[PDB]
Amino acid sequence: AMLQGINHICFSVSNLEKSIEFYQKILQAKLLVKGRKLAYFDLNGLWIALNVEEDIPRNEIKQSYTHMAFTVTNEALDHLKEVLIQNDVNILPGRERDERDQRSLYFTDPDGHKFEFHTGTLQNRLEYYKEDKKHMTFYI
Amino acid sequence: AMLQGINHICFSVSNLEKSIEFYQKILQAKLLVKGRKLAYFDLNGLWIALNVEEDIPRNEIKQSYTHMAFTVTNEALDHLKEVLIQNDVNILPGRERDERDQRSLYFTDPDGHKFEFHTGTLQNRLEYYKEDKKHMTFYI
Ligand SMILES: [Cl-]
Ligand SMILES: [Cl-]
Ligand SMILES: [Zn+2]
Ligand SMILES: [Zn+2]
Ligand SMILES: [Zn+2]
Ligand SMILES: [Zn+2]
């Protein structure tokens, strides 16, 4: 095993001030460093970087389901939904879910990066799939 | 603190077979589940999902520096470079670095998702910046 975990995630942003506010208020990340065109945050031990790229096209990202999910409790999820609405966040309509999928909220940052708050675990999902799914291969 | 860490990351992919091979051989992730249009992996405790979206445009992603970095040792980095070359991986020219930036390799998956192998830590970067940088604010 030559990799030793996530080191950092970096998001390209169009407006540093607007993005800092999102990362602080919505993702609850702690701002560590702010430069002209850069910011670093700690979110529960994860190093997040924002890098400003002002004039690049940001349309196609809307079509891709690439996304990052963070763990929240069921109680936290109901509160967070109102926080997202109060902050005029772009909330995405989620996919159809089985009860066994557990609950999620999907949304974006100002530049289209998709995020999720999720109340389940991988083990919930594997146990669900193993019980229910056909046309699938399980390797564990 | 209402978030409890990364839950999962999901990548939209154009070709499931080709992407599975990349995630196994390049990122060293363990395949857990394969469906028609979905795969799940464990990479050192991180749940990675691949979701197939065949016909979406994937050009603009090339212009954005959004990326995910994984921790490797200096020795691992030299080996991994040859693994990337041997597998015809799209290796990106990195930015200029100070020695204190520590070493990195940057590359993409088949669909343009940018990744990095990095040999430093956040604390290395903060200590460097605090010693050297002007036009910056430090909050820790
Ligand atoms: Cl079926
Ligand atoms: Cl200067
Ligand atoms: Zn998800
Ligand atoms: Zn069937
Ligand atoms: Zn990086
Ligand atoms: Zn100066």
From Swiss-Prot, chains A, B:
Any Gene Ontology biological process: response to antibiotic
Source taxon at top rank: Bacteria
TM spans (from-to): none
Sequence ranges assigned to domain VOC in this UniProt record: 5-120
Record keywords: Antibiotic resistance, Cytoplasm, Magnesium, Metal-binding, Transferase
Entry-linked PANTHER family: FOSFOMYCIN RESISTANCE PROTEIN FOSX (PTHR36113:SF6), LYASE, PUTATIVE-RELATED-RELATED (PTHR36113)
HAMAP family attached to this UniProt entry: FosB
Protein name: Metallothiol transferase FosB 2
Organism of derivation: Bacillus anthracis
